[PDB]
């Protein structure tokens, strides 16, 4: 199966390459392990901040829609055909893997609608939408990093399992094969010298007498 | 002449095993991983080789054989099961497809039922060609039916767990001596093809 | 690259009316289909949230961020927790009339283990 | 001359380089996985599987010619681009491309 | 005295290579697997030494340009390319910075220009020392211009695509014989040295 | 003692720790990239090239001493700040930067 | 017979170290980092082992020992902290509980007070069995009182700040003279047990 003479030279470079790959996988797993909690704290604060900021603007719009009567929120949702706060995808190299980022953009195509002025309730509807846009921009800006946190949380489990599998499976077969190959090479190197010494003793014994 | 050998130096690179294995024409190896699972002998295509299987398959295929395709398919699935188990053990079950999981699932039952040949009774010591050809034909038909049901829409765990005692009855039909059926082919292996064919239609829909 | 500009939301008519008033999502003028799910409290079934979230998350690919309520996401925690993909990213937000809780987020469960 | 070609030496070095790249990427693909492999390793991996089941598979009574072996080696070597082949001269590689 | 060595005891550390490496003064490499891959005459750039490089480079520094700095920088680029190849293979290709891409691109052009050979002397198999130093000076000036252009703000694909005919003419300098120049050097490399400086400003923008 | 200062034994731990941290920081800079490299790995990466290009390279006719080697080690270690040097005593670090 | 076993021939599978390790029943490892850390010997919980601890605990407990109860509890805190360090590194820093911080804090003070010795004074060379017996009982009672105080409602830093000089005096107890009680028993541990019992009520509330 394996060689019987000079086989440790491949196992030494394989063990050194496995150690270097385990060191690089440990460094990348450390960087992803730091970035995962580093994004997880800001996502943990931005979830409650976006929840309260969305709850206040939802309560104000619910109070304005309840005070208005004949709520046109279904008509305002059906009357909308374009958005104002958009997002742009971008790739950012952080720790070696490609993460998803979001860039907020302002749309100047639609600012006011046909439901923003009808009478006395239009000032309350525009007053609710004016705080709703400012809460929506901070809600999207706080909710932008969820794809990067979800990507790093998925990448760290593969990196730790790959580094643990390679580091757990690397050294012992090559070391245990190299030790038995060195011992077999030592015994095979010793037997030919023992036979040549055994023949050399009887060869020198004839010349020693004469 | 059938002569077994053992490792005197502790490895498989000694002159005793290599000298007797080099002069011989047929080989039947033993895997330590398959031998640790209480299965002896365990070799499909990595420690076993034979040149007279082509001329030997002419007579057994001449009587009523199906071993000519099931032996190459079982040797190919058994040889691919170690390569799928190496990447599944090293990386994991995320870089493999459902076809490799179904092939490893059929190779696990084929290696468990084919490798185990010690026998716990008098009926588990004799192995005819009709029983091994019927078990390998039922395992190959279940492996092809799992790939066809997976191609027509299905899951691997729903296919194996949906099969269940259909494959468990084929795996359990080795503890009885052949005295039923025509001469050596009992009705339990004949009804397993109709039961697997009936379960393959219900597994698709 | 730029392959997602709309923001989906799955919440009540008040939060969806305020988010539509400030501007997050809208209806695309090429098919006549809205990009939001207006849910009614105690008037809608749970089967529509799985078809709306599955159609907005798996059928459409132009959505960048998919919002979800706490109660409506809690009733759809099987399909919402089963979707762990980042394209589009799912952000757990609190619903109206309910408080914020750390057990109603699918990213918190997988983010808790293997930190 | 008259019994062989000149591009057989460059085609043998290109096939040995592609087989060495596919055999080298096949051992590294099992440890790390398919998440860190580029398209160059996948081209040598597909070329090793395509050339492994085509050139190595032959009969025991039929004798293949050297021109049919070079033409079959050019079809297996024609899976990559012309700029990605550097084990042959450009004048002989451009004529027999 | 140029004496080729080979193994004679079944290992890579026999007494013939030990006494030959100690009794000799120059270390030359050779790979049969690299020579079979269209890389002959291949040599080892990581394991080698010579004592006449300072004495031969002393008269070559006065009667010719500074080839000794380009030899140490070319050995350092090939030494860094082997270290970047393990990180590029293990970690991934799209996980490295833009600084290693210029060293890998210069190492690929240096290994393709120096290690790349065809036949014995067919297809311009002759190469003088001044043509080799002038050919390596364009690769070192292109690598230093790419590394200096990438440091001041520049894309990797914009600079690599911004090179264009410079990398093709520098890589294709193994087919131009010495008839194009006077007797030793080629004038196309001297005009390519100013063409690399003129293309360095266009490659940055 | 008499020709060697007392800080030569303490500066070898900071120089060996800076070179050992820069050796892992050199592969960590290519592994992590250009947006995930720490300032400690970048300062040790620049100190590895600056200390390698000035402390281990020398001519064939030049001479060195213990005071010139300690001054070159202090000049090579002077690139780092006072908050990143913690492998020596504070009196020797505050006295010689 | 305390004989050291160094490496010979650059191998670790020789019969000198393997025969001496298999023939002996007591082991005491030494690490290069432990010698630089001022640790003598450089083996905390995984570098040393002994099979004659049952007879030595029967004789030393036969004179006046209390080491037989805290013998497994002394190594159990170091094995729990060493097992918790890998879970804190791989699993996360916030995954551990309040009992693991008190067990690792007690194992750090017990390892720093007991294992941390470099001959700073005249009391760090000669150590009686009474001070080592009461030292493990003080750390065991401090760990049990810290776990029982933390189980009734308290913080980790509030529990350590609630202890204060009670835990700080146990680390500095080695600096005092060994003639505290008669000539060999530490009298600070006897009043430190009642002082820790009285401080356990103030640590919880």
From Swiss-Prot, chain A:
It is found in: Vacuole membrane. The keyword Repressor does not apply. GO terms for cellular component: fungal-type vacuole membrane; Golgi membrane; membrane raft; proton-transporting V-type ATPase complex; vacuolar proton-transporting V-type ATPase complex; vacuolar proton-transporting V-type ATPase, V1 domain. Keywords: Hydrogen ion transport, Ion transport, Membrane, Transport, Vacuole. GO terms for biological process: endosomal lumen acidification; Golgi lumen acidification; proton transmembrane transport; vacuolar acidification. GO terms for molecular function: proton-transporting ATPase activity, rotational mechanism. Its main location: membrane. It is a peripheral membrane protein. Subunit of the V1 complex of vacuolar(H+)-ATPase (V-ATPase), a multisubunit enzyme composed of a peripheral complex (V1) that hydrolyzes ATP and a membrane integral complex (V0) that translocates protons. V-ATPase is responsible for acidifying and maintaining the pH of intracellular compartments. Belongs to the V-ATPase D subunit family. V-ATPase is a heteromultimeric enzyme composed of a peripheral catalytic V1 complex (components A to H) attached to an integral membrane V0 proton pore complex (components: a, c, c', c'', d, e, f and VOA1). Interacts with RAV1 and RAV2 components of the RAVE complex, which are essential for the stability and assembly of V-ATPase. Present with 8500 molecules/cell in log phase SD medium.
Curated annotation (Swiss-Prot), chains B, E, G:
Transmembrane segments: none annotated. It comes from Saccharomyces cerevisiae (strain ATCC 204508 / S288c). The gene is VMA1. The chain holds residues 867 to 1071 of 1071 of the full protein. The modification Phosphoserine is found at residue 62. It comes from the Eukaryota. This is V-type proton ATPase catalytic subunit A, 2nd part.
From Swiss-Prot, chain C:
NCBIfam families: V_ATP_synt_F (TIGR01101). The gene is VMA7. Subunit of the V1 complex of vacuolar(H+)-ATPase (V-ATPase), a multisubunit enzyme composed of a peripheral complex (V1) that hydrolyzes ATP and a membrane integral complex (V0) that translocates protons. V-ATPase is responsible for acidifying and maintaining the pH of intracellular compartments. This is V-type proton ATPase subunit F. Belongs to the V-ATPase F subunit family. It is found in: Vacuole membrane. Transmembrane segments: none annotated. It holds the Pfam family ATP-synt_F. The keyword Ribosomal protein does not apply. GO terms for cellular component: fungal-type vacuole membrane; Golgi membrane; membrane; proton-transporting V-type ATPase complex; vacuolar proton-transporting V-type ATPase complex; vacuolar proton-transporting V-type ATPase, V1 domain. GO terms for biological process: endosomal lumen acidification; Golgi lumen acidification; proton transmembrane transport; vacuolar acidification. Present with 4050 molecules/cell in log phase SD medium. Keywords: Hydrogen ion transport, Ion transport, Membrane, Transport, Vacuole. V-ATPase is a heteromultimeric enzyme composed of a peripheral catalytic V1 complex (components A to H) attached to an integral membrane V0 proton pore complex (components: a, c, c', c'', d, e, f and VOA1). The keyword Ion transport applies.
Curated annotation (Swiss-Prot), chains D, F:
It is found in: Vacuole membrane. Belongs to the ATPase alpha/beta chains family. V-ATPase is a heteromultimeric enzyme composed of a peripheral catalytic V1 complex (components A to H) attached to an integral membrane V0 proton pore complex (components: a, c, c', c'', d, e, f and VOA1). Interacts with RAV1 and RAV2 components of the RAVE complex, which are essential for the stability and assembly of V-ATPase. Present with 131000 molecules/cell in log phase SD medium. Non-catalytic subunit of the V1 complex of vacuolar(H+)-ATPase (V-ATPase), a multisubunit enzyme composed of a peripheral complex (V1) that hydrolyzes ATP and a membrane integral complex (V0) that translocates protons. V-ATPase is responsible for acidifying and maintaining the pH of intracellular compartments. This is V-type proton ATPase subunit B. It comes from Saccharomyces cerevisiae (strain ATCC 204508 / S288c) (Baker's yeast). The lineage of its organism: Eukaryota, Fungi, Dikarya, Ascomycota, Saccharomycotina. The chain holds residues 389 to 485 of 517 of the full protein.
């Amino acid at each position: 199966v394996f060689p019987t003479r000079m086989t440790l030279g491949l196992m030494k470079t394989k063990l050194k390459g496995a150690n270097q790959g385990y060191s690089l996988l440990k460094r990348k797993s450390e960087a992803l392990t730091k970035r995962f909690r580093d994004i997880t704290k800001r996502i943990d604060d931005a979830k409650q901040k976006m929840g309260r900021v969305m709850q206040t603007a939802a309560f104000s719009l619910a109070e304005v829609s309840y005070a208005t009567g004949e709520n046109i929120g279904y008509q305002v949702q059906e009357s909308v055909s374009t958005a104002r706060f958009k997002v742009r995808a971008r790739q950012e190299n952080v720790s070696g893997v490609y993460l998803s980022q979001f860039e907020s953009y302002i749309d100047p195509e639609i600012n006011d609608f046909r439901l923003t002025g009808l009478g006395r309730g239009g000032q309350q509807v525009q007053r609710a939408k004016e705080i709703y846009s400012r809460a929506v921009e901070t809600l999207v800006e706080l909710a932008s990093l969820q794809t990067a946190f979800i990507i790093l949380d998925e990448v760290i489990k593969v990196t730790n399992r790959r580094v643990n599998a390679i580091e757990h499976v690397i050294i012992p077969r090559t070391e245990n094969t190299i030790a038995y190959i060195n011992s077999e090479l030592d015994e095979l190197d010793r037997e030919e010298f023992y036979r040549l010494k055994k023949v050399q003793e009887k060869k020198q014994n004839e010349t020693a007498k004469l | 002449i059938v002569a077994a050998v053992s490792p005197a130096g502790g490895d498989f690179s000694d002159p005793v095993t290599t000298a007797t294995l080099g002069i011989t024409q047929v080989f039947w190896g033993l895997d330590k991983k398959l031998a640790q699972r209480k299965h002896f002998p365990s070799i499909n295509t990595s420690v076993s080789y034979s040149k007279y299987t082509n001329v030997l398959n002419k007579f057994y295929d001449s009587n009523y054989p199906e071993f000519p395709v099931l032996r190459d398919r079982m040797k190919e699935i058994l040889s691919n099961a170690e390569e799928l188990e190496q990447v599944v053990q090293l990386v994991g079950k995320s870089a493999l497809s459902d076809s490799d999981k179904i092939t490893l699932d059929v190779a696990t039952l084929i290696k468990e039922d084919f490798l185990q040949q010690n026998g716990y009774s008098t009926y588990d010591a004799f192995c005819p060609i009709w029983k091994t050809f019927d078990m390998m034909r039922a395992f190959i038909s279940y492996h092809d039916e799992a790939q066809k049901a997976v191609a027509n829409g299905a899951n691997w765990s729903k296919l194996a767990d949906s099969t269940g005692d259909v494959k468990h009855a084929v795996s359990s039909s080795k503890f009885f001596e052949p005295s039923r059926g025509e001469k050596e082919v009992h009705g339990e292996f004949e009804k397993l093809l109709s039961t697997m064919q009936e379960r393959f239609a219900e597994s698709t829909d | 690259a730029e392959k997602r500009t709309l923001i989906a939301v799955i919440a009540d008519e008040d939060t969806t009316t305020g988010l539509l008033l400030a501007g997050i999502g809208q209806i695309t003028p090429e098919t006549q289909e809205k990009n939001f799910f207006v849910y009614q409290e105690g008037k809608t079934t749970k089967e529509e949230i799985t078809d709306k979230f599955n159609h907005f998350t798996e059928e459409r690919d132009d959505i960048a961020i998919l919002l979800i309520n706490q109660h409506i996401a809690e009733n759809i925690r099987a399909r919402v927790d089963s979707f762990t993909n980042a394209f589009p990213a799912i952000l757990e937000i609190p619903s109206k009339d309910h408080p914020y809780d750390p057990e109603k987020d699918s990213v918190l469960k997988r983010v808790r283990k293997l930190f | 001359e008259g019994m062989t070609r000149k591009d057989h030496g460059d085609v043998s070095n290109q096939l040995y380089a592609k087989y060495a790249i596919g055999k080298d990427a096949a051992a590294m693909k099992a440890v790390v996985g398919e998440e860190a492999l580029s398209i160059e390793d996948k081209l040598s991996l597909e070329f090793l599987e395509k050339f492994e089941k085509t050139f190595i598979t032959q009969g025991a009574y039929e004798d293949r010619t050297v021109f049919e072996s070079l033409d079959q080696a050019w079809s297996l070597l024609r899976i990559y681009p012309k700029e990605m082949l550097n084990r042959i001269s450009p004048k002989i590689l451009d004529e027999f491309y």
